[PDB]
Amino acid sequence: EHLEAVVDQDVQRTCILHGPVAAQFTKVIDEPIKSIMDGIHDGHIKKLLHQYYGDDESKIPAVEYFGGESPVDSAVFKATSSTDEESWFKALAGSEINWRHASFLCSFITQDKMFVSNPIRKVFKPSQGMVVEISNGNTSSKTVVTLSEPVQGELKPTVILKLLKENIIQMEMIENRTMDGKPVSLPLLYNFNPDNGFAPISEVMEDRNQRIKEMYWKLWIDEPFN
């Protein structure tokens, strides 16, 4: 790749690796990499429609976001010490592929081109006393989950999952031990991407600290927010 650095600009001196069999398919020059990889993939698509789908696309299945699967309607779930984790997450994500499907099964959340562990999967870790509740599980837009753990003995809502406009996952992270007793909730937003399968949930890091600062306000400072 540096024929400018060979003596007489002659490639015939160079050592360039190649395959004896693959060479008989490489004839068009410098085609875009997307062009050839797509010519392969859609070629397979044509070869697979003609066999198992009769050249009619509508026979296709449909999935919200494709991917995320390791090779290996309004209910509740009480969890205890031995509450198995993966069954727990299955019971929470559900069967349908939606934001709820990933929120417990997607292991990584992008923070603007950086992959860090799923926070939702951290907080909902199976333990004692947690009585999670899934309501309105049929439709996704109206699906809301509420984890209410025991607090000072009694159960009170601690976590609230729900969708927003623009399909924005928010985890209403509540804490009730408050200066006025009335619970304070920490709104954590995330972008759900049905088009990027491997990591559909991408946390909005913009303005992220302010809504944390504002939550901590009412925890400590007895003044307006500025």
Place this chain on the structure above:
Amino acid sequence: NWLEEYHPKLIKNKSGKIFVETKFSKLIGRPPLLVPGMTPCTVSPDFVAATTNAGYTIELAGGGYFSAAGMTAAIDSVVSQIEKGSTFGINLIYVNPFMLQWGIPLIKELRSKGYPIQFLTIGAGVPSLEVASEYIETLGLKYLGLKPGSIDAISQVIN
């Protein structure tokens, strides 16, 4: 029955994008095609970004970087070009322990730093049960990719 168990399925995405659903394509959410690590070819960080913007998994040629800081500058140079949340992986050689004394002690950290490097590939050899053990848990990788060239190298990865 392998003809039905691993039958190549078809998948439509919400955007209306078609996919060849296999067992492999169902971890990467991406077509079941990839470009292997290639020390002359997949060393150029701008190309390893051009294809992963086409949405095809790539290995980054480890054998092209004679250092730890050089490959780090390459990693960050592609991060500067991949779309938000995109991913690539790197390729290591195993007959070159000097190549392996950078990556592993580097991969542990850039992963702990959380880079989009979401798989490894140890080419030109297969590690032992013992050294190939920590690559999956110490290294926050999604999957591991081993290159068999022999008939015993396949028994080894099965081990």
Place this chain on the structure above:
Amino acid sequence: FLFGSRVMIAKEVKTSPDAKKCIAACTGVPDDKWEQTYKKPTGGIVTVRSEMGEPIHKIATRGVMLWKEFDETIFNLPKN
């Protein structure tokens, strides 16, 4: 499936244009006639021993042909 040699001709790779022109000019060989590289250029590709002696597939250019000849004349020959 992974695609090594199919890629090197793409425009996004960094190989020099003349190198791509020859990598296109060489016609491949089907798998039935695959092992004939150890002996000859097979449609423009040979195998040569590494400095470790292990084989490498390379396009049969004048340079790598000289490499091959030196392998079987000079380096195969023993130390003294």
